[PDB]
């Protein structure tokens, strides 16, 4: 049938994992793509620009990005772990999605939070740096200087 015995291929999603958690890499975004039963790597890139051609219909997809965020009076990093679901893929294939982000957080477990995204318009990162910094934390207070 269907029993729980998924995996995750640890060494190939490492690969990429290993650039991106880097902040010097010019890979600034990975993707996570599925096979057999196990999360693969799949594309990567340095501008979000072709992130969001690369946002298809029904397919599912996941995405590993590192995202610069926390201010302090040093610089911090933070990596965000994506999923694309279209509004057009059903349920069944979501319920994969609902039992797969642990598989993917196994590898991404070197991230902040995470992101679900269905529509074009809410894939657009400016609006997501404000929810990022929300999703984050704030302060405002600037005294005792």
């Not at 929810?131 to 207070?141: M, Q, R, T």
Request: charged share 30%; net charge neutral.
């Amino acid at each position: 049938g269907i029993r729980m015995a998924t995996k995750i291929d640890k060494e190939a999603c490492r690969a990429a994992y290993n650039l991106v958690r880097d902040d010097g890499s010019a890979v600034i975004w990975v993707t996570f793509k599925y096979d057999g039963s196990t999360i693969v790597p799949g594309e990567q890139g340095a501008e979000y620009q072709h992130f969001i051609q690369q946002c298809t219909d029904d397919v599912r997809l996941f995405a590993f990005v590192r995202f610069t965020t926390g201010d302090a009076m040093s610089k911090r990093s933070k990596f965000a772990l994506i999923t694309w679901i279209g509004e057009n893929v059903s349920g069944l294939q979501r319920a994969k999605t609902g039992t797969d982000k642990t598989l993917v957080k196994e590898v991404v477990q070197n991230f902040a939070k995470e992101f679900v995204i269905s529509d074009r318009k809410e894939l657009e990162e400016d609006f997501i740096k404000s929810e990022l910094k929300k999703a984050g934390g704030a302060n405002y207070d600037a005294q005792t200087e």
